[PDB]
Each structure stands twice: as C-alpha cells, then as structure tokens.
C-alpha cells in the first residue's frame with residue numbers, strides 16, 4: 001500500500017531486474033527497457049541513457065551508466081551492472097535509477113528517476129522486498145519515473 005508519487009507526472013516508465021546473493025554480497029541490476037519517455041529534444045524525441053547509483057545516507061557510493069540510445073522514447077538496453085553490498089548492509093542502501101537525455105553540450109537533463117531499497121515505498125518497496133525474499137532469483141519489474149525534485153528530496 002502507498003507510494004506512487006510519480007504516477008500522474010507522465011515522464012515514462014523503466015523496467016529493470018534486481019538480484020541479490022547474500023553469501024557473496026552481490027547485487028545485480030539489469031536495465032531492460034524504458035517506455036513512454038517524455039519528449040526532451042525540440043523538434044525530436046529523446047537520446048536516453050540510464051544512470052544507476054548506489055546510495056546510503058545521502059551519499060553516492062558508486063555510479064554506473066548505460067550506453068546512449070538515439071532518437072527514441074522507448075529504448076531497449078539489456079545492460080547489466082553489479083555492486084558489492086555485504087549482507088549486513090543490504091537493508092540500508094538505495095539503488096537509484098535515472099533516465100536522462102543525452103546532449104553533447106550542456107548538463108544532461110533528467111527525464112525522471114526512481115529508487116528502491118531503504119525508505120522506498122509502493123511498487124519500489126515491493127520490488128526490493130521481492131528481491132530480498134528470493135535470494136539468487138532475478139526479479140524484473142516496471143516502475144513509473146518521478147520528477148528529480150521529489151526523488152532527490154527523499155534521498156537527501
């Protein structure tokens with residue numbers, strides 16, 4: 001019950017898998033695809049890529065990113081990333097997933113973002129809980145993207 005703050009924001013959706021292996025402390029995130037992304041380019045679509053940050057207590061611990069897809073609002077990635085999070089630490093971290101529009105000049109604008117893990121809610125909490133309940137199993141789920149202003153206020 002709960003969450004859902006991004007639902008009416010019309011930014012798009014992202015699908016990713018989560019897998020956690022407690023003995024090894026291995027957390028794997030596979031960025032699968034995004035859909036219905038907000039159009040960001042004047043007279044165009046978007047050039048989306050995805051950033052994945054591991055966070056704790058407002059601190060960005062590790063940063064990864066996908067390749068850039070050109071001229072699409074429905075990119076497919078299928079790109080895997082892993083983090084080392086020991087089992088005594090896994091309930092205390094966040095994984096933050098941001099979709100951005102690439103441009104060769106200027107700060108790239110976020111389309112929207114979500115996070116799973118500590119302090120997550122709604123479908124975000126559900127995905128994380130499903131990961132934890134099923135050691136070694138990859139669990140794929142869709143998430144609604146939310147405006148950066150709101151998500152960052154929750155992360156800070």
Ligand SMILES: [Sr+2]
Pocket residue numbers: 040041046047101102103
């Ligand atoms: Sr662009």
